Assembly symmetry: D2
Homo-oligomer: 290 residues x 4
């Protein structure tokens, strides 16, 4: 009944040491919220409310302390550990029992999107019956990502993970919608070129079958880079500038839950009261005025 999604929020975070020896990348602040509120908000905006969060043995417990079972926000959250970061595709192997016979979305715990009409951008993917959908976004450094190449008619024709000679500048982002076939695909994958069970290898299987849709995410959207220390500071600054100008939050899960009807006002006021001593709780309380 509730639609399903997985947030993959593990990984070593090597590239960010020594900051991530101290704290999981997906708990770092992006301005005024931990990084994982952002991909969580994306799933909620797609209308996905049953969500499995996968992290390392050390970090899962921290996420469980941050987010709980999710009922406070009208979600159902559950959790599993990935013993080692053996690839994004292991998400479906670990989450096979959670998924059952249902479709499932996957969002990476470091993926931040923002812009106008995000839900409508996702709508076709959410309602797809058969196949898979990913989103492409023009970047200046396609060699750091999965890269999708299109023909003159705009048909996707190839996908390559971190190519030395990228065939386009379109990166495949960290949000994926699959039908139920993904689970068996993942279970038959072999560790590839970089020694990982790769999501790109799943997507390539869908592409070879003619069932991968590639939704273009235009330049009016922001897909914020979380790859380096510098870009983490840029991401924060970006959110700060939007929020302080508007006096509205970006990816505040309480607010989304409220506006989408997952929780009612009585419940928003119950969340806000114990938090009214800080700016966040004051913002939540304001919601229930009008």
């Amino acid at each position: 009944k509730m639609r399903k999604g997985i947030i993959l929020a593990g990984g070593s975070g090597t590239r960010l040491y020594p900051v991530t020896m101290a704290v999981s990348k997906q708990l770092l602040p992006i301005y005024d919220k931990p990084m994982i509120y952002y991909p969580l908000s994306t799933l909620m905006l797609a209308g996905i409310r049953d969500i499995l969060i996968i992290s390392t043995p050390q970090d899962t417990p921290r996420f469980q302390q941050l987010l709980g079972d999710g009922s406070q926000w009208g979600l159902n959250l559950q959790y599993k550990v990935q013993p080692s970061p053996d690839g994004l595709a292991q998400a479906f192997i670990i989450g096979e029992e959670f998924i059952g016979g249902d479709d499932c979305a996957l969002v990476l715990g470091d993926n931040i999107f923002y812009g106008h009409d995000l839900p409508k951008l996702m709508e076709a993917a959410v309602n797809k019956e058969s196949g898979a959908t990913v989103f492409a976004y023009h970047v200046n450094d396609p060699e750091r990502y999965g890269v999708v190449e299109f023909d003159k008619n705009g048909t996707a024709i190839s996908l390559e993970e971190k190519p030395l000679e990228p065939k386009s500048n379109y990166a495949v982002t960290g949000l994926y919608f699959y039908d139920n076939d993904v689970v068996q695909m993942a279970k038959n994958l072999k560790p590839s070129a970089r020694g990982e069970l790769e999501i790109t290898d799943i997507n390539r299987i869908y592409l070879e079958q003619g069932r991968l849709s590639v939704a273009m995410m235009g330049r009016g959207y922001a897909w914020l880079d979380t790859g380096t220390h510098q870009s983490l500071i840029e991401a924060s600054n970006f959110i700060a500038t939007i929020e302080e100008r508007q006096g509205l939050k970006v990816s505040c899960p309480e607010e989304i839950a409220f506006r989408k009807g997952f929780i009612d006002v009585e419940q928003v006021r119950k969340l806000a009261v114990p938090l009214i001593k800080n700016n966040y709780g004051q913002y939540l309380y304001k919601m229930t005025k009008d």
Copy 2:
């Protein structure tokens, strides 16, 4: 009729002294281009090629040195002066002749909009045969702006200019679309207490007649503040973050002209060659290859 454009780029710039003793506000850089490129970009995206720039007596020559007659970008730019900052609504008096019998789109020289489907956002406004269209955006400090009050059912019911007690948090942005009725409305206005001919008074008349459309600009759009030194730095950082991430420029008049067919590839390369030694020149040239 056809729709002509006015960019109002006047004002003394006192809040920014001494920076604006040296350089007009609308020439200040927002990251990599002068501030006036951004509203000049909003007009082009709306399909407007015939544009009047109104500056102060002092600033006209520098805007002309920057933009010339516009022909390099398939535009036609003209210049008129505003002797003193007597109110936005003076633009229609100053431009009465350039406007003649046509519809008008006025944009303030310091207004910066960014977001997905911005041309669509303005589509209804451009295609409106009579009346006026304005844009409302939720801000944290509505007291600094024109403010539009809505009713329980979503209808604009009052407008107030920089009110001490705002009736809502929706500011009316500095982008306005009018039919041919406005020049006469402007000509019949009397100064407010503060001694300005107010654009808010014009909009109220249209509201009063049931002829004002108020299009909501969602939280997914960015409308960047340029009122303080601090917000300028934020505006620049915000644009930089986008452009460096995408490898694409925000509000590049040459690119928009080219993508909309105002100019052709042979004209783009002609523009690029003299500039080939700098980054801006190299971005132009590449756009002619792939």
Copy 3:
């Protein structure tokens, strides 16, 4: 590791909620390292190698996992829990055994100091035989801090904690050096009207005995604000700007330990390798060559 110092790294983290819901404020990044590296570097630059880290019941062990016993940096680190955030002066009661009969410096865990000749600005306070030294910095908002008032000759005459009517713009910063008498003073204190055991009350005692030295940190020093989410971004951007321009790190404990001779070249190399994927480890490795 003869000389001693305490880093007070706990607190409720209320104002930063929800970022500090699952992470201590003092483990959050300031650009490319955890916040606590900064006050630790500060103590090291003063020549202090025996350091007690006090944090909350939940966070202390997290600091201990990250830093261990400090022998890898030539330091002696030990840890104590502060059961509740009942005031800075509690550091001396908690740290009573650690201190013993010795002088001791206290630095707050969220204090970031930068500027030419800081080690000299301090090295003196370290050499004072008796009494206490504090450092005063001109700020824009003195009401948020301990405030030191000076007479016409420049002699400190008054200290007040968070005064509604500040007598000066000089804030007393979170770096303090004390002789052995501070423990007894702290044991005799009673909470203030804020409900906290106040450092300002200890400083006032010394002031009245005529044994308080107030070092002025001029306008050439930076004492970075870490109060709000916004100020964390500001602090991170400031450090990033320095480091990226100079190709040198600010407050890197491995570098300071190597430069002051706490550890040797071999040791630095061994530390660098596990970090060598990014600039942080490469920077340490090259200090060994050049």
Copy 4:
């Protein structure tokens, strides 16, 4: 009896196109003041009041319109055009008459310096009776600059302009103090490999004469980059961070003039008048009350 200095503020500006198409680079804002205020403040801080500003044929008169003869600040400003940017040493040829038989300092118009005891560092160079003083600063990308090689005992042993294989990471900044011999040295210079009259060739002759002091500007100083659009934003954010924290301005000439006694209270209040309606004028006014 006024000491003499030159601000070299010419050059193409091509790299910053289109931001420099209708605006001189050195009049662009660095946070709340035009760029040229910064080196101007630097010379003032050195106690130099008789200053020659050299720029392009197009920009020199813009500087003259902004600053006048400077006696409002207790300075004596004069102007000369550099027909083309044939090298920094040409400043001493164009400035020969202005120089006469006196010592002369040279600062680049886009260099920004900040740090504790900077005035003392410069007062030393100004106190020097014979020879020259330059300042060395560790940078990430030494190949862009004049580069100074040191002895194992840290004595400066060679200088190279933009070496392909830098011998150290110490760049020679754009602030130079010379005795009167510099004019004859410049006049004998021949164009370098870059076809320029190089300041590094002058410095090398003082160094080989044993008359060059190479003062180290340590890592607690900021020497800010102004060569890219991004470096401009970084320099603005760095200044805004210091100023907003301290409530004190960096390189405000009016403030410097007042504090060094070039002008008095009455004059300060006169300068405040045209600025009195924003924070900058208020800041000036308050210095004369507190």
